[PDB]
Design a protein around this ligand. Sequence first.
Ligand code: ADP
Lengths: 268, 256
Amino acid sequence: KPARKLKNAADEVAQGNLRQHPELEAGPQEFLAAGASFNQMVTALERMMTSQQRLLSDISHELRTPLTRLQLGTALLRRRSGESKELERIETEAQRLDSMINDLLVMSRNQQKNALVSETIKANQLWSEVLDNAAFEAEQMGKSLTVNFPPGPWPLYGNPNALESALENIVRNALRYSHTKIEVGFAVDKDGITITVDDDGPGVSPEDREQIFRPFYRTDEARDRESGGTGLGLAIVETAIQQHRGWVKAEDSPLGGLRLVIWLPLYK
Amino acid sequence: KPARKLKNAADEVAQGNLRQHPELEAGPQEFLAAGASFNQMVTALERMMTSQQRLLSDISHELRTPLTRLQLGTALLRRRSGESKELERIETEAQRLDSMINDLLVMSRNQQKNALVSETIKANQLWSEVLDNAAFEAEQMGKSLTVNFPPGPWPLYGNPNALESALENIVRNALRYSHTKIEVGFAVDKDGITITVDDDGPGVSPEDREQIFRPFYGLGLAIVETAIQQHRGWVKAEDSPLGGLRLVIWLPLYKR
Ligand SMILES: Nc1ncnc2c1ncn2[C@@H]1O[C@H](COP(=O)(O)OP(=O)(O)O)[C@@H](O)[C@H]1O
């Protein structure tokens, strides 16, 4: 009973759930000093991590504002002057920086703050829109999207825009790297929802698969492509799902490409 | 006792000691899975904190490159076209972002140098060198440095280069903005070390004192604040009795 409590609390903290376990302050006899020192440890760790994460959020917010004024200026150029070759350079770079700042803001919105404004939502209600937009996007690319099993009215608790973006990034990423087909499969049990996204694109090496959720990920074969953001997408996915008490895995797809697995616990 | 082992291990990690794997895997069969999962937690936390630091150390590098291509585009427009009003606007914002990125680059060079394994260090051993270099720098500026009370062999846990640079930045800043004198005073109790840096320079308004640790206003005191806060301490900016700015750093003591 007390060893089980401390093991589950250490395994929880190890996944990114830096929250107080009052359960360790009810421990019979002597595991109260160990449990109370453990919760003191959690508080100290949370205070230590939020400092660097805050610096990140502050830089993100300070960078955001002049870039918007810059984006306004370029829009006013396109007004006085026409379609120039230089504008095609400036607006391109402006958008690249824009996406980067926005993604930095998001990664400072997720893991950093406990200030998460959460609500109770149902899986189908949450991701149906994302799946429909992904289906349209697939149709436009001349690619096929098959939802092996759709999400049902399964209870979840957390930030809806965060989870919406978490699945949106996974499926859009699968849309990008795929050759012709993409597959999305939902699955539920007593404990939680498991979303599996497969693509028939080029496989990812077992070394790269382990470090794909890295903030700025040096991808071999996709650096040569240069057809995306900066690699913040998947790190956003990971931080967003981990703060939602879930997990993310990257495996080799039976379609031949990359398999992405998301797991989220059910609300009770 | 196994509860005492786990309590001392949790109290160690709480002080920033991830850089140690205690032997919680040698005793009763039940406390072995808890001990092994605890050490796995320590490794995961260490892996989580070095990744957060890597992110800040990479932002500068990632943002720099497209901004330079943007600055190239605008430069080519001043070449093919004249000096438009909109180009003046875009270039103003481009220079604002430019300076910010350059300062972030400076922050990732200082993080790349000071980036190490947090370890157990003694206050005097840590900052004596910084205080001596600051004394020489004061002498060269025709200014005076008085260490009211020196640091003693007081136990601390953390990155030595980080704390070295934190005090170095505070004292160098106080040397810059002072008129003639700077005072550094150390103080210890059972809980922690309190460093106070004063200068006879121009005072800082109570509004500005609250937003002095803001990132952009060549790293800034924001690094000082975040580095001391990650070292479980705190930083305060008050009005100095010398007439200038008083900077207070507090750091907790390490206990085995
Ligand atoms: N001792 C001081 N006396 C007066 N002004 C100070 C002092 N310390 C800091 N400041 C003010 O605080 C501002 C922010 O500090 P800082 O981040 O170190 O800026 P900087 O990049 O110029 O070194 C400085 O621009 C300066 O005007």
